[PDB]
From Swiss-Prot, chains A, B, C, D:
One of its GO terms (molecular function) is glycerol transmembrane transporter activity. It comes from the Eukaryota. Disulfide bonds: none annotated. Belongs to the MIP/aquaporin (TC 1.A.8) family. It comes from Homo sapiens. This is Aquaporin-1.
Length: 233, 233, 233, 233
């Protein structure tokens, strides 16, 4: 085909342009505690605020480019479908890689508008005071797992029983991760979102855990659904 | 049948694997007040945070294994359908019993990642300072009742007027219980969730009320709908 | 008909039983600031908490008894459809009157479980420090108006363009009133909910405004939709 | 046509009457921090409260007059469809202009009921302490962009894959803007809402940015979707 070949590229575009808006609006809104409405006197973050803002941002982009890429926006999600043999071997590489770019470009646009922040966070997920060093995977490896469990089930197509909005579904499962790992890291349930969070801002401390699991956990879900709960005939 | 007999087991599996994710992510996210983002200096919980996180967690698992078990995840729910003669006499026993295991296994995975908590709660619903001792059923016996009222109505099948997401429906009715008994217990609207909350952590103080009602209240709802509001021809 | 005549009563029942659960769970959860989780040292209410809890409670009951009554639960709503000539002249009286009973019975069940409250509110909407005396209608007469605007539009039936959950729609429009008049009264967007709030608890100070508008405002909406925006051919 | 010509006017009416309710209820509920529930001793605003209240208010009005105008309610939205050649060249002028009136009339009704406010805000979006002067467009020009990205995608009609509520979709994308620019301005993602916010209250300081972008950003989205992601055959 000399058309489908070109319909592939438009998806990888609809993957970059979507993730940048996702990162920008979400990670940007996360920096609302240090940024007041009165003076310099610092505030305290709302767990719910950054849960919905990140969650709803997915359900918004999901309804916006689903029909074009599959609105993965997350390399953990991308790995889920790849292991379920849904997507193409190379499509996984084209989405993941261009997805990381979106997080770099948004951080780059935000870097100009921020500045006023007392510590200059510019989007960062850090193993908080008390949270297990390295073992912070203990949450995430069975944390990000719920989202790829949703994504895989919300797409059965064998299934005649679905209803409502599929994005609002999956996007609410993004507010689940954000409602969970809020006090833990600053919630980094998306490897590309966490990677492009500190690459030009610079701080690669514990970044290897915000990549490896996800990934394994999201792939564990494939076995839970595609091999245990809803395996193909 | 030598297939349906095996399709029963997969449901009891889809009941365990679902409840553990439910308990883990929810009960784990509940321990966000004592766990800060700055130092050791304690914070104050958000009622809304743990309402959605518990609620949305059901609507997430509900869209994820509904088609397999009926995504009960709650022994109060299980008793509702059993009294409506929907489920099997023994299916109730297989779901309830394996459901309690999920809450034990999640607590077990969480027990390693927690530790830093100043009081070491590890998921607990306690009759708070002011809340009626034993008479704390007064809320719950007409509290958990709303959820089994939703579940029974959202499944009529006689009904041609339903729309939207059935999980988001029922899952929002889980955020109703959590938006109600938040200051009261720490919201224990699910007997299996409350049981497996303290069995290895150890504290069986008032645990008999987080079992008996539910149950009766959820069964009262059967009479409200299946005998008063929408009884069968 | 010697069946439809009996199907009328079941609606008036499905109106009482629904409003009591509505009042109980909602008004009960509203008393979460004075009731702590630590000691006696008082807390500060969350505007969002009581908005969703009241809102979602409607969308829950709405999906639960819609098919039976029309899940009015509000005399402001009841007046909207009556003026649109949807419901019966006497059905309005049977719903409104039995609806007020629900609010009395729930307050009665709550009265036993409360007690610990420092001021003993037991569900009350008071013209707060700063809020216009009597002129507090200024909000509500164009406040409750949005909900009857939703209810009337979400029921066109001439309309082929509707989607999603009709309750979640209307129930979210109940969280709109609650997200608006939260600092104002303690949000009393339902005349029966506000009436049965203080009848045995006793405090009829400004209760005439939590009856007259609603009512007029809800009826103004009929003219906005059924005579201005979507009038019948 | 001597009927369609009259069906145009009813839309411009359904645009004014909708925006006034939108502005009133939303902008009115925004003034909930300065207005307490105890005495004069000031409170601190909830980011989430004003996000949903503004967002849900759109999804409420959207389900209420969609079928009549297209429930634009926002001149940024109006410009999106106009550039996509959806609406009429003059319909854009009739909606935008009458939309600004709604924001003036609501402020006028609110002006009587407010008064008690310590600073007398009456709906205002100000470049907060730290937020970039003039460069505050840096957020908004790629901020309001998400909403017109939703609106354009939620209306493809070429698209067979949509589900759930289209308002709740778009209305949640209004809570995205409000969850983002909350600490920044006081969120002014709608040019007409921000214009009619200070015209009789008087304060036109930085009002030119709460008009120009939006606009350009919303039109950039047209190029993102109608020329890059989902362009017409």
């Amino acid at each position: 085909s000399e058309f489908k070949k070109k319909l592939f590229w438009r998806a990888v575009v609809a993957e970059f342009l979507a993730t940048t808006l996702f990162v920008f609006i979400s990670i940007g809104s996360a920096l609302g505690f240090k940024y007041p409405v009165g003076n310099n006197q610092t505030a305290v973050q709302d767990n719910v605020k950054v849960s919905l803002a990140f969650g709803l941002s997915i359900a918004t982009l999901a309804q916006s480019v689903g029909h074009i890429s599959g609105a993965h926006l997350n390399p953990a999600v991308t790995l889920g479908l790849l292991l379920s043999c849904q997507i193409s071997i190379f499509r996984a590489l084209m989405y993941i890689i261009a997805q990381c770019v979106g997080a770099i470009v948004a951080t780059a646009i935000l870097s100009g508008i921020t500045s006023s922040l007392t510590g200059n966070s510019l989007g960062r997920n850090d193993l908080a005071d008390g949270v297990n060093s390295g073992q912070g995977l203990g949450i995430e490896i069975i944390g990000t797992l719920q989202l790829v469990l949703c994504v895989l089930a919300t797409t059965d197509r064998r299934r005649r029983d679905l209803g409502g909005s599929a994005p609002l579904a999956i996007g609410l499962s993004v507010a689940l991760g954000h409602l969970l790992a809020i006090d833990y890291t600053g919630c980094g349930i998306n490897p590309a979102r966490s990677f492009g969070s500190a690459v030009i801002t610079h701080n690669f401390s514990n970044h290897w855990i915000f990549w490896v699991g996800p990934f394994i956990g999201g792939a564990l879900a494939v076995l839970i659904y595609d091999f245990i709960l809803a395996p193909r005939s």
